[PDB]
């Protein structure tokens, strides 16, 4: 296919390039810390108007 002919001679012919392909996926991010003040604005006690 690379020589574009149905007759190959005697020798080494570079055809392609090997390439191991991934087998997964990793998405890593740090821990959680200092949670936002959403516990006293959605679970409040009383409002005004």
């Amino acid at each position: 296919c690379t020589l574009k002919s149905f007759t190959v001679e005697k020798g080494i012919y570079q055809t392609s390039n090997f390439r191991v392909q991934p087998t997964e996926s990793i998405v890593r991010f740090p821990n959680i810390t200092n949670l936002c003040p959403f516990d006293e604005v959605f679970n409040a006690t009383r409002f005004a108007s």
Partner: protein, 125 residues
Amino acid sequence: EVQLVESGGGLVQPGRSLRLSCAASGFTFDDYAIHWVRQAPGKGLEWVSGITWNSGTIGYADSVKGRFTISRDNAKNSLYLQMNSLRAEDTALYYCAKHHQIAVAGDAEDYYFDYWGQGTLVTVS
């Protein structure tokens, strides 16, 4: 440290309206409750109203419902109180008290005063 400047008060005719203001200075006006509590001369005190850290009404007495309106302003850091239909039994020193606790989300309803002010002589006659 804490400077709760109270403004508004004077001689008004019975049945008029007025606006009292309490401005805070020294602490953060986002996590402390502030209450208005009058005090008759030589006849004890009497709680009027109060607001928590956020915009929230806690309630009133059995003789001030529908006549008084309390409001909070976190942009200007001031607690305002508008009074309507003043009578002869409304002559007292209205004090602006603060709260000690930070009023966390999950707790029990228990508010107590920590700082006091000077009060304004709001006479009605």
